[PDB]
Design an enzyme around this catalytic site. Structure first.
Site, PDB file in Angstrom:
ATOM      1  N   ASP A  36      91.342  -0.371 -69.153  1.00 46.82           N
ATOM      2  CA  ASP A  36      92.192   0.358 -67.863  1.00 46.82           C
ATOM      3  C   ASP A  36      92.934  -0.757 -67.084  1.00 46.82           C
ATOM      4  O   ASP A  36      92.168  -1.233 -66.231  1.00 46.82           O
ATOM      5  CB  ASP A  36      91.208   1.092 -67.388  1.00 46.82           C
ATOM      6  CG  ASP A  36      92.262   1.903 -66.177  1.00 46.82           C
ATOM      7  OD1 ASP A  36      91.410   2.557 -65.027  1.00 46.82           O
ATOM      8  OD2 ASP A  36      93.428   2.001 -66.304  1.00 46.82           O
ATOM      9  N   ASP A 226     100.017   0.657 -67.023  1.00 44.34           N
ATOM     10  CA  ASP A 226      98.687   1.165 -66.818  1.00 44.34           C
ATOM     11  C   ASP A 226      98.339   1.673 -68.224  1.00 44.34           C
ATOM     12  O   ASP A 226      98.864   2.930 -68.666  1.00 44.34           O
ATOM     13  CB  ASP A 226      98.686   2.280 -65.968  1.00 44.34           C
ATOM     14  CG  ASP A 226      97.577   2.919 -65.603  1.00 44.34           C
ATOM     15  OD1 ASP A 226      96.429   2.483 -66.047  1.00 44.34           O
ATOM     16  OD2 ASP A 226      97.197   3.846 -64.985  1.00 44.34           O
TER      17      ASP A 226
HETATM   18  C1  LIG Z   1      90.582   7.805 -67.382  1.00 46.03           C
HETATM   19  C2  LIG Z   1      91.400   7.423 -66.632  1.00 46.03           C
HETATM   20  C3  LIG Z   1      91.874   5.794 -66.673  1.00 46.03           C
HETATM   21  C4  LIG Z   1      91.284   7.860 -64.974  1.00 46.03           C
HETATM   22  C5  LIG Z   1      91.292   9.265 -64.995  1.00 46.03           C
HETATM   23  C6  LIG Z   1      90.182   9.855 -64.190  1.00 46.03           C
HETATM   24  C7  LIG Z   1      89.906  11.300 -64.284  1.00 46.03           C
HETATM   25  C8  LIG Z   1      90.772  12.010 -64.960  1.00 46.03           C
HETATM   26  C9  LIG Z   1      91.579  11.697 -65.810  1.00 46.03           C
HETATM   27  C10 LIG Z   1      91.793  10.240 -65.735  1.00 46.03           C
HETATM   28  C11 LIG Z   1      92.835   9.374 -66.531  1.00 46.03           C
HETATM   29  N1  LIG Z   1      93.903  10.138 -67.147  1.00 46.03           N
HETATM   30  C12 LIG Z   1      95.156   9.698 -68.028  1.00 46.03           C
HETATM   31  C13 LIG Z   1      94.910  10.427 -69.356  1.00 46.03           C
HETATM   32  C14 LIG Z   1      93.522   9.527 -69.886  1.00 46.03           C
HETATM   33  C15 LIG Z   1      93.559   8.204 -70.496  1.00 46.03           C
HETATM   34  C16 LIG Z   1      92.871   7.621 -70.925  1.00 46.03           C
HETATM   35  C17 LIG Z   1      91.350   8.070 -71.176  1.00 46.03           C
HETATM   36  C18 LIG Z   1      91.237   9.590 -70.661  1.00 46.03           C
HETATM   37  C19 LIG Z   1      92.365  10.353 -70.276  1.00 46.03           C
HETATM   38  C20 LIG Z   1      96.255  10.113 -67.327  1.00 46.03           C
HETATM   39  O1  LIG Z   1      96.125  10.716 -66.399  1.00 46.03           O
HETATM   40  O2  LIG Z   1      97.494   9.875 -67.917  1.00 46.03           O
HETATM   41  N2  LIG Z   1      92.812   8.356 -67.117  1.00 46.03           N
END
Ligand SMILES: CC1(C)Cc2ccccc2C(N[C@@H](Cc2ccccc2)C(=O)O)=N1
Ligand SMILES: [Zn+2]
Ligand SMILES: [Zn+2]
Ligand SMILES: [Zn+2]
EC number: 3.4.23.46
Length: 397
Positions: A36, A226
């Site tokens: 991340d 990101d």
């Molecule tokens: C996990 C992280 C880095 C932080 C997060 C926290 C809570 C909900 C969605 C996300 C989120 N959303 C991402 C989609 C995603 C990417 C990688 C793994 C799981 C989903 C986004 O919003 O683009 N990314």
């Protein structure tokens, strides 16, 4: 852990990021860890959860030390919280070192661990400034570099079922650049400030046509790289101008509004998608040299993402993977997948080259090209209004 030992060390599901194996504790507990670049904590599931089957068990680690300090991390729609400590950490398919890092053991979370992701925790690779609870919790990569001889750099190659999501792969090369992972020139744009991986976009074109906005609009209120975000996200005004332009180019097809909001798929008969009607998008990044920029060019195959459903199986169906932001531009997996991305922290710069795992179009190529020179370049960076909270905190470091 030579760079051949790190090639292909990432796995994931389309739309749920990329993870790398790590071990925590002694004896080593192996977990799949989301890569991340948009956050700065190393945090691991540390208690039972219906969508996990392993988690960090602190009590089985003879080397764990409790820091007696909680942490709680809100997101737009979810959260995680937990307990800080330190432990020994290694990356089995990375550099051959073991480091004592901070670890947030996640004790509770909401809408964080999703059904079927296969990661058990997150590795925040960005800088101390954005670590929770504060910038005094050393991030993992800072500990790695301080404690070993690994160079202060990492690079990511993120490479692009009737029910289940597509499996993806990639490489995170820690401490170096593997020249087998890219072709052509490596172009660098400066890291503007070391908090997110923040950069500055100077110009935007859709099918070769300049959007003609004040370039600060492109970076309002920042632009960041990101790996933890799926879509290309664009500030409202830029997102509206982009959608207008892509609609124009594709106006042979009238899609519903929900498609452009990413809330509905659009389909063609198998093998027939008219890729030629969707335009390439070029983001021009500020260069190392004043008045210079270079562009990264993405294909429609990067920003329209296939999704197979049960009833829609004679058909190829797609989601629009560009979305509106109110927290600036986010160059997520949609951008990164075309490219080999070098996070050169030693030289405060990010490099882009065309990835060896290329995204394919019939007649066009995702690309990285420069230089493009501007007579009187002028500043495209946005200065976020300074809050009294930011202003008062002392940083005795
Ligand atoms: C996990 C992280 C880095 C932080 C997060 C926290 C809570 C909900 C969605 C996300 C989120 N959303 C991402 C989609 C995603 C990417 C990688 C793994 C799981 C989903 C986004 O919003 O683009 N990314
Ligand atoms: Zn392994
Ligand atoms: Zn003070
Ligand atoms: Zn500080």
């Amino acid at each position: 852990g030579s760079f051949v030992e790190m090639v292909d060390n990432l796995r994931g599901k389309s739309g749920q990021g990329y993870y790398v194996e790590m071990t925590v504790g002694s004896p080593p507990q192996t977990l799949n860890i989301l890569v991340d670049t948009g956050s700065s904590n190393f945090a691991v599931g540390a208690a039972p959860h219906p969508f996990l089957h392993r988690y960090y068990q602190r009590q089985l680690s003879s080397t764990y030390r409790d820091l007696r300090k909680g942490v709680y991390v809100p997101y737009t729609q979810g959260k995680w919280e937990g307990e800080l400590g330190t432990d020994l950490v290694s990356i089995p398919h990375g550099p051959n070192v073991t480091v004592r890092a901070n670890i947030a053991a996640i004790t509770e979370s909401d809408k964080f661990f999703i059904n079927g992701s296969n990661w058990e925790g997150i590795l925040g690779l960005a800088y101390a400034e954005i670590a929770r609870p504060d910038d005094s919790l050393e991030p993992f990569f800072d500990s790695l570099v301080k404690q070993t001889h690994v160079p202060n750099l990492f690079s990511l190659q993120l490479c692009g079922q009737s029910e289940v999501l597509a499996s993806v792969g990639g490489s995170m090369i820690i401490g170096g650049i593997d020249h087998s992972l890219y072709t052509g020139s490596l172009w660098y744009t400066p890291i503007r400030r070391e908090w997110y991986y923040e950069v500055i976009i100077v110009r935007v074109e859709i099918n070769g046509q300049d959007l003609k906005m004040d370039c600060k609009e492109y970076n309002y209120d920042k632009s960041i790289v990101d790996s933890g975000t799926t879509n290309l996200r664009l500030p409202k005004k830029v997102f509206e101008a982009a959608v207008k332009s892509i609609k124009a180019a594709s106006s042979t097809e009238k899609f519903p509004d929900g498609f452009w909001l990413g809330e509905q798929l659009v389909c063609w008969q198998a093998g027939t998608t008219p890729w030629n009607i969707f335009p390439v998008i070029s983001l021009y990044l500020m260069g190392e040299v004043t008045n210079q920029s270079f562009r990264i060019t993405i294909l429609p195959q990067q920003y329209l993402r296939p999704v197979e459903d049960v009833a829609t199986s004679q058909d190829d169906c797609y989601k629009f993977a560009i979305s509106q932001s109110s927290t600036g531009t986010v160059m997520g997996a949609v951008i990164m997948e075309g490219f080999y991305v070098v996070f050169d922290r030693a030289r405060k710069r990010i490099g882009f080259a065309v990835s060896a795992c290329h995204v394919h179009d019939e007649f066009r190529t995702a690309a990285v090209e420069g230089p493009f020179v501007t007579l009187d370049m002028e500043d495209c960076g946005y200065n976020i209004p300074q809050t009294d909270e930011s202003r008062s905190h002392h940083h005795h470091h």
